[PDB]
Amino acid sequence: GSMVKSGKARAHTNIALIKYWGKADETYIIPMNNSLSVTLDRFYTETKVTFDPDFTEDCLILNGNEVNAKEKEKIQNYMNIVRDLAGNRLHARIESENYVPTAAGLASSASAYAALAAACNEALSLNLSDTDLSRLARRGSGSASRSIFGGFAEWEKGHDDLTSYAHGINSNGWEKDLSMIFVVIKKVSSRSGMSLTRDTSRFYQYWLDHVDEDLNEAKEAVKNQDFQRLGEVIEANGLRMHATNLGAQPPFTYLVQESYDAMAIVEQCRKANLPCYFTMDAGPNVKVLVEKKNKQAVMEQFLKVFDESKIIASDIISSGVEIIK
Ligand SMILES: C[C@@](O)(CCOP(=O)(O)OP(=O)(O)O)CC(=O)O
Numbered sequence: 001g002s003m004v005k006s007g008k009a010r011a012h013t014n015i016a017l018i019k020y021w022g023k024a025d026e027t028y029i030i031p032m033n034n035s036l037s038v039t040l041d042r043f044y045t046e047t048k049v050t051f052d053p054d055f056t057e058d059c060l061i062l063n064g065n066e067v068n069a070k071e072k073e074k075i076q077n078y079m080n081i082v083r084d085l086a087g088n089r090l091h092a093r094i095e096s097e098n099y100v101p102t103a104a105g106l107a108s109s110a111s112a113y114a115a116l117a118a119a120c121n122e123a124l125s126l127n128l129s130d131t132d133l134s135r136l137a138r139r140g141s142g143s144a145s146r147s148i149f150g151g152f153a154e155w156e157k158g159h160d161d162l163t164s165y166a167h168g169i170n171s172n173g174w175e176k177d178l179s180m181i182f183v184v185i186k187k188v189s190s191r192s193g194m195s196l197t198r199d200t201s202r203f204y205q206y207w208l209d210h211v212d213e214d215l216n217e218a219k220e221a222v223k224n225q226d227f228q229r230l231g232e233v234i235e236a237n238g239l240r241m242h243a244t245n246l247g248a249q250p251p252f253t254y255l256v257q258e259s260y261d262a263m264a265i266v267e268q269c270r271k272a273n274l275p276c277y278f279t280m281d282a283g284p285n286v287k288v289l290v291e292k293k294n295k296q297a298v299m300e301q302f303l304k305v306f307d308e309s310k311i312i313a314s315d316i317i318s319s320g321v322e323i324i325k
Helices: 069-086 109-124 130-138 142-146 190-200 204-223 227-246 257-271 292-302
Strands: 005-018 023-025 035-052 059-062 091-099 152-156 165-169 178-183 276-279 286-291 311-315 322-324
Touching: 005 109, 005 142, 005 204, 005 227, 005 276, 023 190, 035 109, 035 142, 035 178, 035 204, 059 069, 069 091, 069 109, 069 130, 091 109, 109 130, 109 142, 109 322, 130 142, 130 165, 142 152, 142 165, 152 204, 178 292, 190 204, 190 227, 204 227, 227 276, 227 286, 257 276, 257 286, 257 292, 286 292, 292 311
Parallel strands: 059 091
Antiparallel strands: 005 035, 005 322, 035 091, 035 152, 035 311, 152 165, 178 286, 178 311, 276 286
């Protein structure tokens, strides 16, 4: 198509091992602390953008279907950022597929915005650095900043739009030895929940006082390829993030009894020499970090209690966002 510029990208979801939770800046999505994550091989979003001078506004088609006017308006504002960045006024048709178990509660924002950013950079030929790609994705969703990268990644909080972005952490191939089990188990949205907590939680300072120590400990753990050291700090970090919500005004939780059951089975696996550690995000699902060599053994412990359909593993991918057909 002569007057038409398109680009399609595939970006993979990532789970935070050290949590992003609370913004310093609501408009530009600058976080109150750094976060560390691992990018999952099995779950991803494919997003294609097609820019046409004769397009009157941006259109979003998701999983084969028109989105409502609310999502339409939201995506148009985001694309304004893109147009501003490219110095054009081209509108786009955006066709995205989420290969993420969203019905099952898995988040799609990270992969969604990371795929969109990359797709736009490819379509418009902006030649953005990974850094600028991460920055553009961050404007859409904080955790999207990390999905530009594979393996371990860290989002550096910074102090403004220029300085807040993620980068990949080389772990000497360690990500290749690791896996994650997902225990599948309206909700307050991540953005809304973290805002209430950051603004009002009586336990939020306590979170702030320990996160840098956690991050450093975890980073040193990764350098050492020390799984136990990594798991213990990340599990504690996770629980601390949920603690902060308990302190909110008024309190709330994302966890339910079943989540706690899942946690018990992880600790059971530890005492029985199957090392693994758990984490939870903005919902009751429990994610179990385990070494690949133990994925199966640990999975079968869970399959004693939970339906087979609700136990889902993914490996950690080494490569970052990719341009596709
Ligand atoms: C619990 C978390 O998963 C929170 C993620 O929240 P979002 O990345 O969805 O927040 P927004 O920036 O408002 O889009 C922890 C994490 O990924 O660091």
